[PDB]
Amino acid sequence: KNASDINTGIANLKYDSRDILAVNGDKVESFIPKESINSNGKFVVVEREKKSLTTSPVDILIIDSVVNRTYPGAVQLANKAFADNQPSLLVAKRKPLNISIDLPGMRKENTITVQNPTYGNVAGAVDDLVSTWNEKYSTTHTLPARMQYTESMVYSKSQIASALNVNAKYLDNSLNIDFNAVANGEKKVMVAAYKQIFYTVSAELPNNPSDLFDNSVTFDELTRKGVSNSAPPVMVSNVAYGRTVYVKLETTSKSKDVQAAFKALLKNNSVETSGQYKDIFEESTFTAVVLGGDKVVTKDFNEIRNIIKDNAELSFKNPAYPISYTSTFLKDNATAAVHNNTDYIETTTTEYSSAKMTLDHYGAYVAQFDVSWDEFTFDQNGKEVLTHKTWEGSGKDKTAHYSTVIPLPPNSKNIKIVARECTGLAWEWWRTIINEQNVPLTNEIKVSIGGTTLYPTATISH
Question: For the domain bounded by 147-196+243-312, which CATH number is listed?
Answer without folding.
Answer: 3.40.30.40
